[PDB]
Amino acid sequence: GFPPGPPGLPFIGNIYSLAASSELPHVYMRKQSQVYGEIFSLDLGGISTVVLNGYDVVKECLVHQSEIFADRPCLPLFMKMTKMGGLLNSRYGRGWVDHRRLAVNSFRYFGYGQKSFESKILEETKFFNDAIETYKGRPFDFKQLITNAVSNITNLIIFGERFTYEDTDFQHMIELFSENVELAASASVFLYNAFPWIGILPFGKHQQLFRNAAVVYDFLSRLIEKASVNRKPQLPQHFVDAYLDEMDQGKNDPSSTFSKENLIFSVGELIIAGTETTTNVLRWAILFMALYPNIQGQVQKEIDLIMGPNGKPSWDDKCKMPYTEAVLHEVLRFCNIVPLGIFHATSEDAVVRGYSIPKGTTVITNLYSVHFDEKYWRDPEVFHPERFLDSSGYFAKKEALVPFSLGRRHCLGEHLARMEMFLFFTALLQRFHLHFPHELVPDLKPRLGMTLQPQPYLICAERRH
């Protein structure tokens, strides 16, 4: 019948287990799969949940049974925030198809599908690097500038413009939205979802999340208004105009799923999905380059060979730069920015590997455990870019690397993110040498959150040529 799993206390189930563990949840779950198998279950305060561990079981569900596992779970928090509409936490259905299709098309059309786009990224690297230079090699935290820079790339697509690094109102909105992605992972919210009557309690991380969500919702709708002011119907300049075009064409269809609400939800989802994740990839990579300068320098050696010490980075250089691509893939594999993906749910009663999974069960894809699957990786616990190089020195793509997930819900911003990653990384490492202050001992244990990010750390960036 249902998959087995560790026991915990009545009422709260394995919320106790996760909470009581020294380990972060994805690590905890991986360890439990060594006892209970690749597919096991957790009881999260009475919400029944199955966890998928290792590459084979994750592929078997999200790919072989893609429609069955394409859904999102109706956790109280998700219902409150977005009523299971929008895009990211939309239920699998027509609503999702509509918003997904529009986003995919918008990102090609207003983004990388256009000849001029790559240089808009490069402009952002100049703004970014220039900002870094202003510190004149003195130690500082990159978090804010990186966030500014990365978020601007999607701002171009969604709003048709970048915002300046003085726009603290926008920055403040992103700051609250990040807290929410972090708080989504807390015991407090796992309990809230189990016992939603906890909403009566005025104190705690759940009230912080709802308060934040309110402030974020208002701001985003105000931006969306400002973005639609000069709109020329059926000639859109960005995703917002495109969305409004859609609402116009579905005016007489009552079952049309586009709405002012769903526009705010899907815009917010697109903004935070891009900013949280890519920012953190770069923050992890910078951390590791400062920690392992022989790797940093080998990357820089390739930049100098292929880009020259002075030439403008190009996406087209990627395939002349396998060691650089290797480092970046190894950051993704090792640091696991989205360790447990986004939770799925079964759109119907499912049977997988003999076990039954009733419709609506939360299904956690432990992407961490895929990246550490010893069937497919040698010494996964070791940071070693070289694992991605083949015997001729070229980058070798591995099927068991899935940091953007698989199946119907796979990251929709994958291609854009890879361009940003590559171009920001090379632009930065071409212009600066990075190292820690007083060579201070930095912390590599990630913070608990729906994404993994490093603790605050200072860096010195010193010009090179």
Ligand X SMILES: OC[C@H]1O[C@@H]2O[C@H]3[C@H](O)[C@@H](O)[C@@H](O[C@H]4[C@H](O)[C@@H](O)[C@@H](O[C@H]5[C@H](O)[C@@H](O)[C@@H](O[C@H]6[C@H](O)[C@@H](O)[C@@H](O[C@H]7[C@H](O)[C@@H](O)[C@@H](O[C@H]8[C@H](O)[C@@H](O)[C@@H](O[C@H]1[C@H](O)[C@H]2O)O[C@@H]8CO)O[C@@H]7CO)O[C@@H]6CO)O[C@@H]5CO)O[C@@H]4CO)O[C@@H]3CO
With a CB cutoff of 8 Å and minimum separation 6, the contacts of 415 are 107, 112
Contact partner, 409, from ligand X, ligand HEM, ligand V2H, none, Cβ < 5-8 Å per class: ligand HEM
Binding mask 406-445 for ligand HEM (x = CB under 6 A): ---xxxxx--xx----------------------------
- φ, ψ (nearest 5 deg) of residue 412: -90, -15
**Among 41-49, 274-282, 288-296, 436-444, the segment contacting ligand HEM (CB under 6 A):** 274-282
| Sign of CA pseudo-dihedral 62, 96, 268, 73 | negative
Note whether 208 binds ligand X by CB under 6 A.
yes
- What's the CA angle centered on 382, arms 379 and 383, to 5 degrees? 135
Tokens of 355: 């076990």
- Rounded Cα distance between 398 and 417, Å, is 18
Among 29, 50, 273, 452, binds ligand V2H (CB under 6 A): 273
User: What is the identity of the amino acid at 175?
Assistant: E
- Rounded Cα distance between 364 and 304, Å, is 43
- φ, ψ (nearest 5 deg) of residue 86: 65, -135
Contact partner, 272, from ligand V2H, ligand X, ligand HEM, none, Cβ < 5-8 Å per class: ligand V2H
**Smallest separation, CB 270 to ligand HEM (Å):** 5
- What's the CA angle centered on 341, arms 340 and 344, to 5 degrees? 105
Considering the complex, state which of residue 208 and residue 298 has its C-beta at the smaller distance from ligand X: 208
- Near ligand V2H in 300-359, by CB under 6 A: 338, 342
Binding mask 158-197 for ligand X (x = CB under 6 A): ----------------------------------------
Tokens of 175: 């700051």
Among 71, 269, 302, 330, binds ligand V2H (CB under 6 A): 269
- Rounded Cα distance between 257 and 110, Å, is 22
User: What is the identity of the amino acid at 94?
Assistant: R
**Smallest separation, CB 257 to ligand HEM (Å):** 14
Considering the complex, state which of residue 173 and residue 419 has its C-beta at the smaller distance from ligand V2H: 173
Q: Which residues are annotated as a binding site for heme?
A: 411
Are 36 and 1 in contact, with CB atoms under 8 Å apart?
A: no
Give residues in contact with ligand V2H (CB under 6 A).
81-82, 86, 88-89, 180-181, 184, 213, 216-217, 220, 264-265, 268-269, 272-273, 276-277, 338, 342, 450-451
Give residues in contact with ligand X (CB under 6 A).
201-204, 207-208
